[PDB]
Amino acid sequence: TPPLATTIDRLRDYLDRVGFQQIYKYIVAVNHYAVTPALITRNTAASVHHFFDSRLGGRAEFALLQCLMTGRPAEHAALPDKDRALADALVTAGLLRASPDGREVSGADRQLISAFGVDLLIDRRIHFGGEVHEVYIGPDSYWMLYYINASGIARTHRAVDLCTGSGIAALYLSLFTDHVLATDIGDVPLALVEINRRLNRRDAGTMEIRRENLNDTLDGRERFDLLTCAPPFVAFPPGYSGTLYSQGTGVDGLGYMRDIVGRLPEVLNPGGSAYLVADLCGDAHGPHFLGELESMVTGHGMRIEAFIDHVLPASAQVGPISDFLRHAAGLPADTDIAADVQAFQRETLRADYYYLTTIRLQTAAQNPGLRMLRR
Numbered sequence: 001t002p003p004l005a006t007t008i009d010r011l012r013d014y015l016d017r018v019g020f021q022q023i024y025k026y027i028v029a030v031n032h033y034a035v036t037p038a039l040i041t042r043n044t045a046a047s048v049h050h051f052f053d054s055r056l057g058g059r060a061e062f063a064l065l066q067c068l069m070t071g072r073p074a075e076h077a078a079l080p081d082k083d084r085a086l087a088d089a090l091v092t093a094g095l096l097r098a099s100p101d102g103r104e105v106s107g108a109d110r111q112l113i114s115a116f117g118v119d120l121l122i123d124r125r126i127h128f129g130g131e132v133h134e135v136y137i138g139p140d141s142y143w144m145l146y147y148i149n150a151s152g153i154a155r156t157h158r159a160v161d162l163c164t165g166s167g168i169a170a171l172y173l174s175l176f177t178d179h180v181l182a183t184d185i186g187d188v189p190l191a192l193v194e195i196n197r198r199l200n201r202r203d204a205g206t207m208e209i210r211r212e213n214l215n216d217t218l219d220g221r222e223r224f225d226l227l228t229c230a231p232p233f234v235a236f237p238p239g240y241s242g243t244l245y246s247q248g249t250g251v252d253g254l255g256y257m258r259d260i261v262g263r264l265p266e267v268l269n270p271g272g273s274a275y276l277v278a279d280l281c282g283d284a285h286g287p288h289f290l291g292e293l294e295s296m297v298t299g300h301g302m303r304i305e306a307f308i309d310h311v312l313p314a315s316a317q318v319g320p321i322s323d324f325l326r327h328a329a330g331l332p333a334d335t336d337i338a339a340d341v342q343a344f345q346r347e348t349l350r351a352d353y354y355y356l357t358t359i360r361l362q363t364a365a366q367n368p369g370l371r372m373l374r375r
């Protein structure tokens with residue numbers, strides 16, 4: 001809407017005025033900035049507040065910035081005059097809260113971060129409070145984008161970010177090409193990527209946002225030079241309900257990965273490349289999914305490179321998966337979810353380990369083959 005659009009314009013003006021992106025980059029430092037979005041969290045916010053208070057002297061020009069970054073309250077009367085009208089607009093938009101007596105502003109459900117040179121509003125509940133969030137972002141998103149060869153992107157390359165969520169992959173691609181498609185089906189992420197597109201001075205002139213199922217985009221007539229996708233891929237036991245952003249399709253959670261890879265020879269232009277990321281089950285030698293990709297090498301002459309950037313024994317995921325299932329469905333604490341997850345890992349997934357894997361796939365490769373990089 002026009003009032004929201006103007007509010008976001010003024011918010012980006014504020015971020016530019018006070019150098020938000022540089023401050024965020026300084027706080028997390030260059031050895032963490034691209035590792036994970038979980039840097040400013042409930043466990044580090046006190047440290048962030050101390051930095052602003054003592055190293056930046058508590059200057060009022062950073063007050064509204066901290067409401068957005070950590071949720072820290074700022075007294076309404078202490079905001080500079082230009083920041084105070086913007087703060088009122090953000091409260092009206094539901095992007096910040098006012099205290100009940102109207103005397104301060106503080107965090108709502110959106111946290112402001114930066115990643116890959118882009119300013120991004122994300123679901124605050126993933127790093128603060130702990131309540132089940134409605135939009136995902138994780139280190140996996142970052143590791144996808146890290147492996148993209150940005151110098152090979154032309155302005156006229158057609159790129160698509162499927163299952164865009166907050167929009168981070170689409171906004172990254174929009175740094176380099178003027179033709180980006182970003183898709184999702186959730187009302188909440190779709191609203192958020194609209195905001196984040198405007199927040200980075202973009203509009204439908206160079207980035208289309210589309211409400212569309214993954215398989216519809218992939219079956220379509222559109223052809224792309226570059227594709228990214230971090231799709232729902234978590235595998236939950238039969239009977240359990242996850243969330244739209246987490247639960248993968250198929251018996252092992254990887255149905256969306258299968259869907260994408262199978263259509264790449266038809267959806268990419270020859271020589272185009274796709275970047276995917278998923279947490280893949282496997283044995284001691286590696287993720288089971290890579291065995292399915294040999295059909296792509298032989299049948300389509302692709303080059304497929306898998307970058308294994310984190311390994312965990314399956315037993316280390318039982319708690320996190322069970323906790324997530326318990327909270328997402330509001331289950332009580334006497335349910336034996338842990339045994340259900342274990343049995344599912346053992347019997348259906350055959351998962352001794354989980355491999356957090358980025359995969360680059362190229363069509364019409366001059367050096368076809370499958371390559372697995374492990375440390």
Ligand SMILES: Nc1ncnc2c1ncn2[C@@H]1O[C@H](CSCC[C@H](N)C(=O)O)[C@@H](O)[C@H]1O
Pocket residue numbers: 135136137138140141162163164165166167168169183184185186189212213214215229230231232244245246
């Ligand atoms: N069939 C489908 N088609 C398109 N998007 C889907 C989909 N099923 C789930 N989604 C969306 O897929 C996203 C996965 S979370 C991924 C968010 C983002 N790509 C990131 O890496 O941070 C969620 O936003 C969810 O709404």
Ligand SMILES: [Ca+2]
Pocket residue numbers: 027028029
């Ligand atoms: Ca730090």
